[PDB]
């Protein structure tokens, strides 16, 4: 019998000194003894959802605050840092945006003057969705990934993701996204730029030298968002190291900002069908990573602010999705320190110590 969390000690208190301690979180998730998990474990949240573009804004005009309201509010109420995710996606962003005035897709367009005219009407919707959404926030967010996944996996040129956004703006959807989010949320605002497989060539030095040119022409970035989505024998620990202190390298901040461990390699196939199903064996390999992990995040805690996990316990992870994607409908993962019914795993003994 593994105790329940509110049980333990705190992971917040654990790490106080060196970083963060952060969950991803739906609203639905801020009472009971979910919230009082939260509020005794972490000292950081961000919003799993409810800040994304089309969570925000999903049409011209029309903003739904909300769900994340509920969030901000929950933060306050817990004296929580409060990481704001995200200005700027190529999903769970709304359709509106990439439409010309006569209501045609703008990456159609084949006429170069008029694909200018739509560079520019796309930058200024951009501008002002960042606009208002900041300026609420802006007094409670203590770290904004002002942009999300924005490199290329492959590809040894710049390497930048040929999204929507990038095919009408090229990289200025960047530039200005940053810009508009320092005029707007001050100058002392933390403001990061966010994606996964970081640690990993040529990804992180496609990253590396997209950073590299924003900060060359005073685009005003503060820090690399690391998100961490991670298995259990990949990346390396040196890997992660490598990573983390080439982008300090660059007078950045790092944040690991999505942090999961999953039980299974890529793609993640076969996987188990229920967490009941998972070995013992696994939760103790999952335990053994874990353990390596936050010995090198302590190691870095010079360069490192701020760990989020995505999520709070196994109950409710986005790689459950991505397991039933592969694996014909079926398929649990089970990525936290924390089991489906709160209680603690292996992996949470190896991180507290
Ligand atoms: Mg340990
Ligand atoms: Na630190």
């Given at each position: 019998?593994?105790?329940?969390?509110?049980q333990?000690?705190?992971?917040?208190?654990?790490?106080?000194?060196?970083?963060?301690?952060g969950?991803?979180?739906?609203?639905?998730?801020?009472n009971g003894?979910?919230?009082?998990?939260?509020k005794?474990?972490?000292?950081?949240i961000?919003?799993?959802?409810?800040?994304?573009?089309?969570?925000?804004?999903?049409?011209?005009?029309?903003?739904?605050?909300?769900?994340?309201?509920?969030?901000?509010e929950?933060?306050?109420?817990?004296?929580?840092?409060?990481?704001?995710?995200?200005?700027?996606?190529?999903?769970?962003?709304?359709?509106?945006?990439?439409?010309?005035?006569?209501?045609?897709?703008?990456?159609?367009?084949?006429?170069?003057?008029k694909?200018?005219?739509?560079?520019?009407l796309?930058?200024?919707r951009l501008?002002?969705?960042?606009?208002?959404?900041?300026e609420?926030?802006?007094?409670?967010?203590?770290?904004?990934?002002?942009?999300?996944?924005?490199?290329?996996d492959?590809?040894?040129?710049?390497?930048?993701?040929?999204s929507?956004?990038?095919?009408?703006?090229?990289?200025?959807?960047?530039?200005?996204?940053?810009?508009?989010?320092?005029?707007?949320?001050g100058?002392?605002?933390?403001?990061?730029?966010?994606?996964?497989?970081?640690?990993?060539?040529?990804?992180?030095?496609?990253?590396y030298?997209?950073?590299?040119?924003?900060?060359?022409?005073?685009?005003?970035?503060?820090?690399?968002?690391?998100?961490?989505?991670?298995?259990?024998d990949?990346?390396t620990?040196?890997?992660?190291?490598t990573?983390?202190?080439?982008?300090?390298?660059?007078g950045?901040?790092?944040?690991?900002?999505?942090?999961?461990?999953?039980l299974?390699?890529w793609?993640?196939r076969?996987?188990?069908?229920?967490?009941?199903?998972?070995?013992?064996?696994?939760?103790?390999?999952?335990?053994?990573?874990?353990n390596?992990?936050?010995?090198?995040?302590?190691?870095?805690?010079?360069?490192?602010?701020?760990?989020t996990?995505?999520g709070?316990?196994?109950?409710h992870?986005?790689?459950?999705?991505?397991?039933?994607?592969?694996?014909?409908?079926?398929?649990?993962?089970?990525p936290?320190?924390?089991?489906?019914?709160?209680?603690?795993?292996?992996?949470?003994?190896r991180?507290?110590?």
């Open positions: 019998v593994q105790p329940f969390a509110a333990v000690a705190s992971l917040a208190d654990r790490y106080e000194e060196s970083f963060d301690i969950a991803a979180v739906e609203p639905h998730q801020l003894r979910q919230g009082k998990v939260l005794h474990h972490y000292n950081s961000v919003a799993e959802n409810a800040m994304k573009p089309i969570s925000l804004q999903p049409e011209e005009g029309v903003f739904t605050w909300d769900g994340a309201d509920a969030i901000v929950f933060a306050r109420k817990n004296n929580m840092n409060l990481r704001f995710h995200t200005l700027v996606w190529h999903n769970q962003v709304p359709d509106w945006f990439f439409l010309d005035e006569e209501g045609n897709p703008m990456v159609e367009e084949t006429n170069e003057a694909r200018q005219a739509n560079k520019e796309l930058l200024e501008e002002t969705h960042i606009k208002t959404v900041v609420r926030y802006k007094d409670d967010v203590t770290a904004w990934d002002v942009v999300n996944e924005v490199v290329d492959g590809t040894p040129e710049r390497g930048l993701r040929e929507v956004w990038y095919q009408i703006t090229g990289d200025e959807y960047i530039r200005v996204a940053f810009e508009t989010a320092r005029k707007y949320a100058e002392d605002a933390k403001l990061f730029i966010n994606d996964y497989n970081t640690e990993v060539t040529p990804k992180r030095d496609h990253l030298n997209l950073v590299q040119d924003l900060l060359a022409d005073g685009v005003p970035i503060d820090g690399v968002g690391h998100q961490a989505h991670i298995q259990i990949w990346p620990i040196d890997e992660i190291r990573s983390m202190e080439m982008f300090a390298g660059l950045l901040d790092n944040q690991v900002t999505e942090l999961d461990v999953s299974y390699g793609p993640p076969p996987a188990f069908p229920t967490y009941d199903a998972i070995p013992q064996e696994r939760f103790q390999a999952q335990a053994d990573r874990y390596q992990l936050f010995e090198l995040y302590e190691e870095l805690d010079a360069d490192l602010s701020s760990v996990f995505w709070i316990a196994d109950n992870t986005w790689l459950d999705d991505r397991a039933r994607e592969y694996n014909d409908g079926v398929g649990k993962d089970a936290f320190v924390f089991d489906p019914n709160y209680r603690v795993k292996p992996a949470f003994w991180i507290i110590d």
